[PDB]
């Protein structure tokens, strides 16, 4: 029981929820403590990525 | 022997995985001054030049 | 050992971080009983992919032994442990390789230009940096940018060169970044040309840096022009920055302009800025 | 019934609803940084909120009836009652 | 379709067819 009750879909839609949250807080103390987020997410970009942004 | 047989320098060994630049950039590791930090020196010495002339003039 | 690695290899695990940690789980194991040959041949054979091979990383389609020659913590172990354990020519391929494959990242070009930095060849340093920055095109490429323009400063190649470089990032420089690399195009150009020309692209760069900046631009073009020349070529300045600035930028640079005339002792330009602001 | 009369005018040749609206924005200047600022702290608030309910789930899921309870305390005290109803009429016939 | 165009024409209902915050600081 209570995996009976928390079949994994519903897990798997929370880790997504608590990942585009994380993401909101992360950006918003980068922008708060002055840094760029985008710069510093520029630092990871890939060249597929990259081109597909372009 | 893993931590001494790898360069580390794109590995991160402590997550398994790559090394982020959103973490630790690369100018971290530099041992001088970027374009940014560099000509805001020029900027910073600019302004105290131009408030150090305005003043003698007054 | 080997061959249970071997059937584990042949395993179609579920995801492709499980069949990366597998390979790794292989390097590891020859690199604690130290076989840095079999290790490397290990992940030779891990990372093996056609030339031209393109196949999605996430797609839930194909199998994970076809879709692990791209993943990325395969190659960022492959090439530290060949730069570790071989020679530069050895991860100068691995690198390329990488670079082929198109998993390459700013963080990866500025690596292996350190590489080559590191074994003291600037010149294929540089042409590390121009091949990133043709292939991240301008918000990335500064900082790629950044870290070039210092290093090819600090190498102090010919100034003709080093004026390419500069008007090839200003070619398309969003105006964010335009301020700082008008900043040092017009600072090399003083420490190491003409100050006309240093004149002439501190004009450009108070035409192309941001609104944000303008005033800020054109009182740095002001302030170095007066250190290099005279007041009275601090007026026409003055005249275009009043005519092209916004209302509150062109009220103070009125009366900055005011103030130097007064200075000068014209009392009759004085008093036209004077009336022109008031009007305004 | 300034409100009727917005496009007429005062004395010094001023329209009422001018006079509204300057009104308006001056109440609004004043507010908007510190209305600004709750809206900020208001959603920093509210999506870590978020961020711990999820967190908290995450530990219910890491570590994991009355009618079974009841049926087991049950099943307990009449296999007890077995036991001493056995040794009571002497039921030993282990081996 | 002529055909079912015509069974429509003949059995059409006109029944069937007939029924078809902010402030003034921040205005
Ligand atoms: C140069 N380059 C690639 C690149 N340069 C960029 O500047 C940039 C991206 N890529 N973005 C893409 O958005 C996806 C999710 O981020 P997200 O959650 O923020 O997107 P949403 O929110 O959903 C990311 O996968 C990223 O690809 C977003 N972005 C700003």
Redesign the interface.
Same mark, same amino acid.
């Given at each position: 029981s209570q995996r009976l009750a928390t079949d994994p879909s519903q897990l798997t839609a929370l880790s997504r929820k608590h990942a585009i949250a994380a993401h909101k807080l992360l950006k918003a103390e980068i922008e708060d403590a002055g840094g760029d987020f985008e710069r510093k997410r520029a630092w990871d970009w890939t060249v597929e990525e990259a081109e597909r942004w372009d | 022997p893993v931590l001494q047989h790898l360069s580390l320098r794109n590995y991160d060994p402590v997550t398994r995985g790559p090394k982020l630049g959103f973490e630790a950039p690369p100018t971290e590791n530099l041992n001088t001054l970027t374009l940014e930090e560099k000509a805001a020196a020029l900027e910073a010495e600019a302004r105290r030049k131009a408030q150090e002339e305005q003043e003698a003039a007054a | 050992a080997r061959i249970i690695m071997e059937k584990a290899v042949k395993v179609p695990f579920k995801s492709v971080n499980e069949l990366a940690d597998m390979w790794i789980e292989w390097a590891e194991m020859e690199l604690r009983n130290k076989n840095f040959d079999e290790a490397v041949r290990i992940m030779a054979k891990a990372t093996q992919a056609p030339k031209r091979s393109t196949v999605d990383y996430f797609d839930e389609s194909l199998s994970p032994q076809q879709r692990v020659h791209k993943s990325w913590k395969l190659w960022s172990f492959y090439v530290d442990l060949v730069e570790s354990t071989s020679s530069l020519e050895e991860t100068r391929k691995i690198y390329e390789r990488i670079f082929e494959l198109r998993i390459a990242t700013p963080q990866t070009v500025v690596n292996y230009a350190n590489l080559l930095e590191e074994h003291h060849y600037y010149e294929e340093s540089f042409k590390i940096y121009e091949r990133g920055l043709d292939l991240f095109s301008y918000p990335v490429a500064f900082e790629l940018w950044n870290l070039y323009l210092t290093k090819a400063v600090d190498r102090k190649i010919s100034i003709e060169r080093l004026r390419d470089l500069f008007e090839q990032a200003i070619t398309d420089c969003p105006p964010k970044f335009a301020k700082v690399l008008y900043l040092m195009y017009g600072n090399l150009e003083e420490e190491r040309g003409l100050a006309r020309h240093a004149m002439r692209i501190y004009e450009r760069a108070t035409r192309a840096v941001a609104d944000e900046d303008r005033a800020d631009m054109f009182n740095f073009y002001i302030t170095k022009s007066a250190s290099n020349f005279g007041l009275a070529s601090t007026r026409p300045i003055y005249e275009r920055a009043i005519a092209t600035l916004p209302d509150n930028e062109a009220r103070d640079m009125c009366l900055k302009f005011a103030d130097m005339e007064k200075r000068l002792g014209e009392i009759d330009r004085a008093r036209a800025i004077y009336g022109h602001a008031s009007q305004f | 019934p300034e409100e009727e009369q917005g496009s007429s005018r005062n004395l010094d040749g001023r329209r009422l609803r001018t006079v509204t609206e300057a009104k308006?924005?001056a109440?609004?200047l004043a507010?908007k940084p510190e209305m600004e600022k709750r809206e900020k702290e208001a #959603? #920093?608030k509210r999506?870590?909120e978020?961020?711990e309910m999820?967190?908290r789930?995450?530990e219910?899921?890491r570590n994991?009836?009355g009618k079974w309870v009841e049926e087991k305390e049950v099943m307990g005290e009449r296999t007890r009652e077995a036991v001493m109803e056995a040794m009571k009429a002497g039921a030993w016939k282990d081996n | 379709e002529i055909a079912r165009n015509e069974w429509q024409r003949a059995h059409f209902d006109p029944k069937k067819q007939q029924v078809g915050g902010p402030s003034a600081s921040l205005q």
């Open positions: - | - | - | 308006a924005l109440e609004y507010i #959603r #920093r999506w870590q978020i961020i999820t967190e789930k995450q219910e899921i994991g009836d | -």
